[PDB]
Amino acid sequence: EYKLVVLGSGGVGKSALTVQFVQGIFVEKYDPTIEDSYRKQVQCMLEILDTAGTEQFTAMRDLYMKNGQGFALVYSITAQSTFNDLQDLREQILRVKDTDDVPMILVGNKCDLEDERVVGKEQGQNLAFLESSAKSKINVNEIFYDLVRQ
Template sequence: MRDLYMKSGQGFALVHSITAQSTFNDLQDLREQILHVKDTDDVAAILAGNKCDVEDERFIGKERGQNPARQWNNCAFLESSAKSKININEIFYDLVWQINRKTPTYFIHQCCTYMKRVHCII
């Protein structure tokens, strides 16, 4: 089921907790699985270190959190807090920007034409 979501996904937010080593360790395998399923190295993705609001519980330093992003074709990186709503919108704005940049214009035109035919408003 997870592979199906990856195959049809256009962009991926890879999120780990800055307070838990295990979530950080899972990132590389998750990214490799996405690249394998998508059969490309060019995938819209952002790496986010979550829970930046609990600095006193930090286990993963910011520099260490950024390292995978640098190795992954300069993948975007942000620290966020879902609880405090820090950088949450920015994660999605960046991801949508990447997706739009990678989406061929003819595909966008086809989608818009289809939406007009079915009278769908987004």
């Protein structure tokens, strides 16, 4: 059993990544109201705790942080302000879990569209790092592989 958490600001692609990993957009209908909605077997079972849709409810991310074992800090390369928002979420994990180090992955979503990029690759590596895309299936599975290793 493993519990992984997806974090980030609104309009970043959190829900798109979650669905695209557990099942897949279009190929099958997505029911988020059943027991195995966010669970996928890879040989071990993973549960994705995504904060998408519940960002205004701070208690929701805190609950997911306490129960989480791996963390995915996601931002958009088309949105300048979204990379800035990651510093707070980073420190909040160490605060809720009350630990020195936490297994986490840094994710730069929406890497498929370059003609709208305002956030270069530069900034990511300095703070593992991936440039992924949910709608283009780039590095979707890879994100959640790192966390199980860590």
